[PDB]
Design a protein around this ligand. Sequence first.
Ligand SMILES: [Ca+2]
Ligand SMILES: [Ca+2]
Ligand SMILES: [Ca+2]
Length: 84
Amino acid sequence: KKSTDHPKYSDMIVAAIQAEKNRAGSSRQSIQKYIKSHYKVGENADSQIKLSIKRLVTTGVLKQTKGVGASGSFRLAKSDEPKK
DNA sequence: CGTACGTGCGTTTAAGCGGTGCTAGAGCTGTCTACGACCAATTGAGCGGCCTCGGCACCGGGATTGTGAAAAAAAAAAGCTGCA
Ligand SMILES: [Ca+2]
Ligand SMILES: [Ca+2]
Ligand SMILES: [Ca+2]
């Protein structure tokens, strides 16, 4: 149930998080360097991507390991695929 | 392969120039004497000589440190799958 909401740069983080085959790795600057393939505002992109993550983390759908700016490490987790 | 650099635009900035006006201070002049050259006589600090004995160079033996191979683990990465 509940309210599903619209994200944008959010999408492009989760696209780019899965578009690396790894165990616990995705530092904001690695992500940005891939995803700077553009329609995007490259000048203001990092803040919005940085802003974007915190909320993904707070939902816990995206999962990370010990830090904040220092760690730069997370991936998609929980358990979501098409299912009953 | 990702981007830090070079290129070339238009916009902005202050260097450059020529000039005027003020005075700090560079430098020049003459005077006067404190201070350094020079001298000779005086004597002790430091030279060469020479003698010694203890630090230090060299050795052997025992302790310790670090390297490297070999065996075996932990992991990372590769090649291999069907699905969706
Ligand atoms: Ca580079
Ligand atoms: Ca003067
Ligand atoms: Ca001597």
